[PDB]
Amino acid sequence: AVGACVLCNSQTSLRCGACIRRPFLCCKCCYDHVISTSHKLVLSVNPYVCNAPGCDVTDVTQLYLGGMSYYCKSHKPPISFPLCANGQVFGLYKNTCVGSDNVTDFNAIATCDWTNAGDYILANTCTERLKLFAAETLKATEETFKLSYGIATVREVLSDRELHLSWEVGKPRPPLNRNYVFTGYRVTKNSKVQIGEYTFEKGDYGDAVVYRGTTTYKLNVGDYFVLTSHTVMPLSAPTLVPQEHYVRITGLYPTLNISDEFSSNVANYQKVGMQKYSTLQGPPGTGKSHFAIGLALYYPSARIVYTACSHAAVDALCEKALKYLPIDKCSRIIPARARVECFDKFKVNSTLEQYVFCTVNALPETTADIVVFDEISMATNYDLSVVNARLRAKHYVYIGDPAQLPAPRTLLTKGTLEPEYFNSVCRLMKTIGPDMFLGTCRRCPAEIVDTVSALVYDNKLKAHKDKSAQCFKMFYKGVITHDVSSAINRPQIGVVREFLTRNPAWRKAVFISPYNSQNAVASKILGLPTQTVDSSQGSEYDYVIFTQTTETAHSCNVNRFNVAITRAKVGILCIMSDRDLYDKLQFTSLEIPRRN
Amino acid sequence: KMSDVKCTSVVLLSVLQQLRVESSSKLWAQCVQLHNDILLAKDTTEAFEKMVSLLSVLLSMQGAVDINKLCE
Amino acid sequence: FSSLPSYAAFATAQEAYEQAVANGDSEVVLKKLKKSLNVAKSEFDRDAAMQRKLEKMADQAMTQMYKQARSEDKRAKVTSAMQTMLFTMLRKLDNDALNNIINNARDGCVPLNIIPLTTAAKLMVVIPDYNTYKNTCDGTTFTYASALWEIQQVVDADSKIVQLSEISMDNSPNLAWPLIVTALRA
Amino acid sequence: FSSLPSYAAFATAQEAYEQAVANGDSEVVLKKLKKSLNVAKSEFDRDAAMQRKLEKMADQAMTQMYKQARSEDKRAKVTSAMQTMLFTMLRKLDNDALNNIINNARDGCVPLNIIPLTTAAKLMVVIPDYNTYKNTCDGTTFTYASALWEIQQVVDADSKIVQLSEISMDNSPNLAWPLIVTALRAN
Amino acid sequence: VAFQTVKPGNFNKDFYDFAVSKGFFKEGSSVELKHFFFAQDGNAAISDYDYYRYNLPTMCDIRQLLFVVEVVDKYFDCYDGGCINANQVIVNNLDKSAGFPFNKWGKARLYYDSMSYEDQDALFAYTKRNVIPTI
RNA sequence: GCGGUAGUAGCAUGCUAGGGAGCAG
RNA sequence: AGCUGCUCCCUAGCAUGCUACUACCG
RNA sequence: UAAAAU
Ligand SMILES: [Zn+2]
Ligand SMILES: [Zn+2]
Ligand SMILES: [Zn+2]
Known part of the structure; x- marks a missing residue:
């Protein structure tokens, strides 16, 4: 039960059981x-407490x-x-460990509660192994x-699926969402018995x-539901494989003249094979996705x-692939999950197909x-x-826009993240350079493009493609009919009704x-x-409602707002009360x- | 000196085994036959001929990242 | 053993008897110095022995745990250490014949079949690109494994026969590059 | 090793000893209080050593009966297993023709070797080389042991299927070449 | 049908390097490596077992045998044996493969245990009047 | 001051059991 | 995945034997 | 208070 010092990679047999995640520590580092x-x-190989029954002095320094025993x-x-002695703590290989100076920020990590961007801002700038542990x-x-x-708990049953529930008084009530699951226990006297997932x-x-x-199962009244927790496996693969180069393209093989519609990007295609990996920054879904599939075709x-x-992202991507690829394609996507349905084409589990999603x-x-x-x-x-651990390939390509939407990471509530610090490759893009770039829209009406470039972009x-049929009724916001703090405003649909009928052909749009x-x-x-704005970011539409x-x-x-309004091809409309936008x-x- | 090439043959055959090469009777049979003959070989050069003849087999598949091990 | 508490008492009794037998005093006084020193040896070994047993347990535990650790250590890394030892022995062995194909394979010259030795017998190698060919395919004789092979049936990844003479840097950017060469020894 | 009638005698004798020793009185005091570490501990030698062996012997008896129990458990398990093996083995053979050839015996005992030869329902043949195959189960059906067998399903050493077409004379040096042929009893 | 192979032995390097360093194995030396761990492919078991083709039905001369057997017997005068009761046998190393098909359950100790000291005696005294084929 | 019965720790022998490894046929 | 045979090493346990000093009686 | 696991 040994390992490497999370700060020195030296041999040891210790773990700060007081720290949550039990990381290996060299001697000096532990001290x-x-x-x-x-x-x-x-x-250590055993706990460190006084073995005389009753003594519970657990401050090791005592x-x-x-x-043989403690x-x-x-x-x-x-x-x-004495255990805690001479600026060190006794452990295996004590006389070999080197120790170093990363202890301050280390404790800073281990002691924060992820409430203020600072502990994040350090989480994204420490050493890679440290980043992992973070x-x-x-x-x-x-x-x-x-x-x-x-x-x-249940209070009374109404139908097969209609029910009245009872919440714990004085406790946080989590939201009604497809991302929550509850184990159902009913108790006889005796017989606290799980009934299933709901x-x-x-x-x-x-x-x-x-x-x-x-x-x-038939429902009762002596029933209740516990939201089911989860575990978290430890990781060990780096975030970014060390960047490299080569003198000549290897592994992959171009065609000849096939598909010129993807012309200029071949330049990027070569250098992609010429590196170990690379990135690409692009405004919404333009060359993005397009270029990916084009390269896939290329070799x-x-x-x-x-x-x-x-999920919706990989779905939009797989359909865009279907648009151009041999089939000869699969999206081995979801086992016994898929609370929201997704892919409709092929298997979920053989790993034979060349183009797997x-x-x-x-x-x-x-x-x-x-x-x-x-x-x-x-x-x-x-x-x-995680992905660098589960998979293993030669050339990697990451794509995105640091102006899009990051991980919710709900826990933070004090301040805001600079996009630069969303994660590693975010920095990489924002720091030295995106290595390859693309700057033109092929998907959106020119007018909304003008608006956005006037905003978060620098008019770049x-x-x-321009018109038409676009508006922004700054319709005052009616009653916030918020069930939980999750927002609902029925009188907002109180004017959708006025476009539930006035709509001539805006009948196949998507609402956001x-x-x-x-x-x-x-x-x-x-x-x-x-759909939801998050579940967007992947598909375009002629008309969209907002x-x-x-x-x-x-x-x-x-x-x-940007990533929402940037999902439309010819028609669009957004309704905020709006003091400024x-x-x-x-x-x-x-x-x-x-x-009209 | 010849001891070197013999032990080398042994190690190499062990490797091939570790790569599950015995899932094809013809290949595994040829390999074992070669290795045996090596261990009984009493000249300097015929040893090398059979040796490379074998090593080719490992060269076949792509399980052993060659460049990485070639880090010297 | 020395710094033990009972050793203090045994030392006191021994020194007291030393002073007594030095002064050469009465016999009735040593009746204690015997009934007070025998006990010292008694109340003393019954503790030097007891710590001694633990002192052997410590050994016969550590000497076991060590090998138990390094055991499962060595049965974790075979298909890794084995390969690097192999290539170490290779490099040490030093035979140009081998090194040739080894470098070639670092490049890409993977043979799709066993290298034969009969003067006849066929050979199928792979070539990725032009310079590889130029660094290897020279006329109709093929130099591989430091051996001379007669080039007979080039074919690209479209599985179509291609004219040997057509192979040159100019028109090469038009070929299903994984080329499959076949040949025979001298 | 704490709550004993010897322990209490020890405690009270020692208490009287401390009392009359802090008194430092008579020589009879010394006598009657040395007759304490000398007379009140013989019981405390016996019952505080004998009782230490009672536990040892009871516990070794317990562990040996544990081992015997687990032993006889394994016995039941394995005998159940082998009984199951027997009962499932026979449940694949009782064709009437077996009974028939039994009834043809002048006694009811027949040599083992001829049972499967005549009464099996499926034959497996192992072939080394091509010429040899030609000289036996060549074609889609053949005869053997005065009976007619029909070929179906043919595999190789690697246990992969192969069709009869591939079995040429010159394609043969392309196969794991000691084939297994399974044929069926044709009527 | 199943085929079994025989993997090659594993090599101990550092000791080999050591032995080299102290001057062994140089060309023309008296001693060199000749014993090794030969490997075997898949047609080993059967192609070995076939060797019984060298076994022939031979009728040995009977009259001279009837006397050579006497001489051989005389060679064994100074010993003694006989049946022994089950509780007296000695089995050094109770863990060896248990033949067929008992290797489908466990080694010997399992069996040598689940039987009484009479099951063995009953069985022994049973063979003294009946025949038991084996595998 | 000796002899017999109770302790201790040590030593010697051996016997059993258990476990690891190697050689010969 | 065997039948033996010899050998080394480690461990436990029992009993003996022996030693002595500590306790009871002579 | 937004995604979402042999
Ligand atoms: Zn801590
Ligand atoms: Zn450290
Ligand atoms: Zn304590």
Whole structure:
């Protein structure tokens, strides 16, 4: 049970059991972490407590090894050794470890609670191994916090799936979302017995709530539901394989003249094969995706794997691939999960096909020629190491836009992240240079392009295609019918009704919402299939509808707004109360009785 | 000196084994036959001929990242 | 053993008896110095022995745990250490014949079959690109494994026969580059 | 080794000893209080050593009965297993023709070698080389042991399927070449 | 049908390098490496077992045998043996493969245990009047 | 001051059991 | 994945034997 | 308060 010092990679057998994640520490490093922190309990091949029954002095600095065993100050044998001695702590290979100076920031990491960007701002700039450990303890703290939510029980049954529930008084109630699952226990006297997994969702009124179940069990009244926790595996792969070069392209083989529509990018195609990996920054989904598939085409015999974090993202990508590829294609995507449905084409598990698509967390453990991560502007270094561990290939390509939407990383609530610090490759792009770049829109109406380039961009884009049928009724925000703090505004649909009918052909559009529950209620007084701004970022549409909640910080987020409005091809419309943005948007707003 | 090439043959054959090469009877049989003959070979040069003849087999597949090991 | 507490008592009794037998005093006084020193040896060995046993347990535990560790250590790394030892022995062995093909393979000259030795017998190698060919394919004789092979049936990845004479740097950017060469020894 | 009638006698004798020794009184005091470490501990030698062996012997008895129990457990397990093996083995053979040839015996005992020869339902043949194959199960059906066998499903050393077409004279140096042929009893 | 192979032995390098360093194995030396761990492919078991083709039905001369057997017997006068009771046998190393198909359960100790000191005696006294084929 | 019965620790022998490894047929 | 045979090393345990000093009786 | 696991 030995290892390497998380700071010196020296041999040791210690773990600061007081620190959450139990990381290996060299001697000197351990001495310093313990001398400067409330962290005191050190674990070795055995725990370190006084073995005389009753003594619970667990501040290691007080303890003494006796004959073979450990002892307090009092119950110590006549002969012994003091453990915490001579600026070190006794452990295996004590006389070999080197020690170093990364202890300060180390304790800073181990002691923060991820509440202020500073501990982040350091999390993204420490050493790689340290970065790993940081991500580990971050996700662990997230999980532990998740436990803090309350418990739910049943109060009375209404239908097969209509029900009235009872919450814990004085406890945080988590939201109704497809990303939550509850183990159901009913108790006889005796017989606290699990009944199955059950998700939830708000019905048509309170507190009638729908639920999807694992089995057809009959419901009762002495039932209750616990949100099911989760574990977190430790990681060991670096975030970025050391960057390299070569003198000549290897591994991959171009064609000849096939598909000139992808012309200029061949230049990038060569240098991609010429490096170990590289990045590409591009405004929304323009050359992005387009270029990826083009390269894939370029080297035919090249086994290629696409992957991202957002399900809808990999879905839009796989359909764009279907648009041009032999089939001869699969998206080995989701086992017994897929609470939201996705791919419709091929298997989920053979790993024979050359062009395999999937989601990161559901990836196998396989090899390939190249691999193209996507939407790095949303992922965390955690996931990057995950993919570098599960997979192993020659040339990697990461793509995204540091002006898009990052990981929610809900835990932070004080300040804001500079995009530069979302994760490693984010820095890499923002720091030295994106190595390869693309600067033109092939997907969006020119007018919204003008608006955005006037905003978050520095007026640095161009494209084609202009009109029409665009507006920004600055319709005051009606009642925030917020079920949970997740926002809903029914009188916002109170004017969608006026475009639920006035719509001549705007009947096949997609609706987009800042919040999930206002999106669900849009599915209620239905107009069309809708989605969330996050679940966007991957597809374009001719018409798109947009209503907003209040001017809350989450709502008025410029980046969310940008990535939302940048999903349309010919028609668009967005409805905020809007004190300022409608001054920045360039359309033709109207008034409630003025809708043609 | 010849001891060197003999021990080398032994190590190499062990490697081939570790690579699950015995899942094809013809290949594994040729390999074992070569290795045996090496261990009984009593000249200096015929040894090398059979040696490279064998090593080719390892060269076949792509399980052993050659460049990495060639880090000297 | 020395610094033990009971050794203090044994030392006191021994020194007291030393002074007594030095003064050459009575016999009735040593009746203690015997019934007070025998006990010292008694109350003393019954503790030097007891720590001694633990002192052997410590050994016969450490000497076991060590090998138990390095055991599973060595059964973790075979398909890794083995290869590097192999290539170490290779480099030390030093035979131009080998080094040739080894470098060639670092490059790409992977043979798709066993190298034969019969004066007849066929050979199938792979070539990635032009210079490889130029550094190797010279006329119709092939120099591989420091041996001379007669070039007979070039074919590119489209599985179509290609004219040997056509192979040159100018028109080369038009060929299914993984070229499969076949030949025979001298 | 704490709550004993000898321990209490020890404690009270020692208490009286401390009392009359701090008194430092008579020589009879010394006598009656040395008859304490000398008479009140013989019981404390016996019952505080004998009782230490009672535990040892009881516990070794317990562990040996544990080992015997686990032993006889394994016995039951293995005998169940072999009984199952027997009962499942026979459940693949009772064709009436076996019974028939039994009834043809003048006694009911027949040599083992001829049972499967005549009564098996499936034959497997192992072939080394091509010429040899030609001189036996060449074609799609053949005869053997006065019966007619039909070929179906042919595998190789690597246990991969192969069709009869590939089995030429000159394609043969392309196969794991000691083939397994499984044929069926044709009527 | 199954085929078994025989993997090659594993090499101990540092000791070899040591032995070299102190001047062994130089060309023309008296002693050199001749014993090794030969490997075997898949047609080993059967192609070995076939060697029984060298076994022939031979009728040995009977009259002279009837006397050479006497002489051989005389060679064994100074010993003694006979049946022994089950509780008296000695089995050094109780863990060897248990033949077929008992290797489908465990080694010998399992069997030598699950039987009484009479099961062995009953069985022994049973063979003294009946025949038991084996595998 | 000796002899017999109780302790201690040590030493010697051996016997059993258990475990590791090598050689010969 | 065997039948033996010899040999070394480690460990436990039992008993003996022996030693002595500590306790009871003669 | 936004994604989302043999
Ligand atoms: Zn700590
Ligand atoms: Zn350290
Ligand atoms: Zn204590």
